[PDB]
């Protein structure tokens, strides 16, 4: 946690320019923000800096996975700037880049109280260290250029704050590479780390983890360590199909599949058996003939398989019944990742049914923790934010805490 680290409440910001990493990677639909949770969560740190006399606050974040190519068409942070203005009651200057001489000039000596938002960090390959070129070939950033990127970010403030809890599992340039003498954790980082420290110290048992979503390559690699902490796991959403293909030889069509993760599925199941972790996988599905809101839909089971060219985008009723049975057994639940494409109504029933069960569980004393940019948007969509124990801004970041890891964005902060 942060007991050993500098935090914003101990940082003198009067007359200082503050460069602040935030997680403004908000969900979007029809080019509009669908949930401003992650933006509102950063307002306490921003307002604290302004109220205590900061010369300026320079905000930097990524949006989506543009893979090191500028894509202002679909991944610009400009809409976040307009949303942040109304949440702050103050104007926000949006810059169309995050590094280079023009950005440096705009941030060098701003008018007192200026709030500046920079363009998407991941438009530059040096933020993640790797990406793709505009033709889609995978590329690696050059070390000299990564150092220059970090040096440019470091010029934009006198002191650094990291409030980007949702990104704190990423050792990316903006998260671990800023070279300023004082590097402090923000109030969202403190709030989230303190909550999880308490909730993970001696979880109530049975402790269920619900793992869904679409970031299969990343998150399947977290299960091994989770199996030492939990008593049950639901594996749903896009995660399930890699398991069902390997274990059941199920036909999955064009459903999400991770070739590298497929190679560890049997090892994970053996470890779950060794550790007494009950694994619940879906047994039926809502299918789609294309990845589209208005796709033709169908039904499938594990026995039937998903037809060629179709994809499973939600679980079916028998799966929901099994998910509900595990939720009913739990005394503590951590849930990251919707169990279907809940943004599209044809494919939202399984996630809504599961949310209903989690809310009922909270009512009878279960500790229920929902985290993630997209999973927290389920809470907003069905108006359950106040009906679960905690809604976190971190998804993958919360799973890495469940694993017992120190997060790089925390580790990179100054020590007291």
Ligand X SMILES: Nc1ncnc2c1ncn2[C@@H]1O[C@H](COP(=O)(O)OP(=O)(O)O)[C@@H](O)[C@H]1O
User: Of 122, 150, 190, 215, which lies in the binding site for Cl ion, with binding defined by CB under 5 A?
Assistant: 215
- What does 23 bind: Mg ion, Na ion, ligand X, none (CB cut-off 5 to 8 Å by kind)? Na ion
Number of chain positions touching ligand X15 (CB under 6 A): 12
The β-bridge partners of 56 are 17, 114
Residue 68: DSSP 8-state: T
Site track for ligand X15 across 197-216, x = CB under 6 A: ------------------x-
Contact flag: residue 337 with ligand X (CB under 6 A): yes
CA angle 164, 170, 171 (to 5 degrees): 110
Residue 13: DSSP 8-state: -
* 276 is a catalytic site residue: no
- Which residues ranging from 366 to 385 are in contact with Mg ion (CB under 5 A)? 373-374
* 215 is a catalytic site residue: yes
Q: How far is the CB of 163 from Na ion (least distance, A)?
A: 7
Residues contacting residue 274 through CB under 8 Å, at least 6 positions apart = none
Identify the CA nearest to 354 among candidates 245, 280, 300, 290.
280
Torsion of CA 146, 118, 67, 342, to 10 degrees: 150
Identify the CA nearest to 265 among candidates 288, 249, 286, 251.
249
Contact flag: residue 25 with ligand X15 (CB under 6 A): yes
User: Which of these segments, 104-112, 153-161, 183-191, 206-214, binds ligand X (CB under 6 A)?
Assistant: 206-214
The answer to whether the beta carbons of residues 98 and 34 sit under 8 Å apart is no
Nearer to Mg ion, 97 or 403 (CB): 403
Q: DSSP for 151-167, please give it.
A: HHHHTT-SEEEE--GGG
Contact flag: residue 59 with Na ion (CB under 5 A): no
- Burial code (b: 16+ CB inside 10 Å, e: under 16) for 282-310 equals bbbbbbbeeeeeebeeeebebeebbeeeb
Nearer to Mg ion, 203 or 373 (CB): 373
Reading the block at residue 204, the tokens are 């109530």
Contact flag: residue 65 with ligand X15 (CB under 6 A): yes
Contact flag: residue 338 with ligand X15 (CB under 6 A): no
CA 79 to chain centre: 19
User: Which of these segments, 32-40, 60-68, 96-104, 218-226, binds Na ion (CB under 5 A)?
Assistant: 32-40
Nearer to Mg ion, 127 or 374 (CB): 374
- What does 217 bind: Cl ion, ligand X15, ligand X, none (CB cut-off 5 to 8 Å by kind)? Cl ion
- Active-site residue list: 38, 215, 373, 396
Residues that bind ligand X15 (CB under 6 A): 23, 25, 65, 166-167, 170, 215, 372-374, 395-396
List, as residue ranges, the binding site for ATP: 214, 219, 238, 312, 343, 374-375
List, as residue ranges, the binding site for Mg(2+): 214, 217-218, 374
């Amino acid at each position: 946690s942060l007991s050993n680290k500098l935090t914003l409440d101990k940082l003198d910001v009067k007359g200082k320019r503050v460069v602040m990493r935030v997680d403004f990677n908000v969900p979007m639909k029809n080019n509009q923000i669908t949930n401003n949770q992650r933006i509102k969560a950063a307002v306490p740190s921003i307002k604290f800096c302004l109220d205590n006399g900061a010369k300026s606050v320079v905000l930097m974040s990524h949006l989506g996975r543009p893979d090191g190519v500028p894509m202002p068409d679909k991944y610009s942070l400009e809409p976040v700037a307009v949303e942040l203005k109304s949440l702050l009651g103050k104007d926000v200057l949006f810059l169309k880049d995050c590094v280079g001489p023009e950005v440096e000039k705009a941030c060098a000596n701003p008018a007192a109280g200026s709030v500046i938002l920079l363009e998407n960090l991941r438009f530059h390959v040096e933020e993640e260290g790797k990406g793709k070129d505009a033709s889609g070939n995978k590329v690696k950033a050059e070390p000299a250029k990564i150092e220059a990127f970090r040096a440019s970010l470091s010029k934009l403030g006198d002191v650094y704050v990291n409030d980007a809890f949702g990104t704190a599992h990423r050792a990316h340039s903006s998260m671990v590479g800023v070279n300023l003498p004082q590097k402090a954790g923000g109030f969202l980082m403190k709030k989230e780390l303190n909550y999880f420290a308490k909730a993970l110290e001696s979880p109530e048992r049975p402790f269920l983890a619900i793992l869904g979503g679409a970031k299969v390559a990343d998150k399947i690699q977290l299960i091994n360590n989770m199996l030492d902490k939990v008593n049950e796991m639901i594996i749903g959403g896009g995660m399930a199909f890699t398991f069902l293909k390997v274990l059941n030889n199920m036909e999955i069509g064009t459903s999400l599949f991770d070739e590298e993760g497929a190679k560890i599925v049997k090892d994970l199941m053996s470890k779950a058996e060794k550790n007494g972790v009950k694994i619940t996988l879906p047994v039926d599905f809502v299918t789609a003939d294309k990845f589209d809101e208005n796709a033709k839909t169908g039904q499938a089971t594990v026995a039937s398989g998903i037809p060629a060219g179709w994809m499973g985008l939600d679980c079916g009723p028998e799966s929901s019944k099994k998910y509900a049975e595990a939720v009913t057994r739990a005394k503590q639940i951590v849930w990251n990742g919707p169990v279907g494409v809940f943004e599209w109504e044809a494919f939202a029933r399984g996630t809504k049914a599961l949310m209903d069960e989690v809310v009922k569980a909270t009512s009878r004393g279960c500790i229920t923790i929902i985290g993630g940019g997209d999973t927290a948007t389920c809470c907003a969509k069905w108006n359950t934010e106040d009906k679960v124990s905690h809604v976190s801004t971190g998804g993958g970041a919360s799973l890495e805490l469940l694993e017992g890891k120190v997060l790089p964005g925390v580790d990179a902060l100054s020590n007291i």
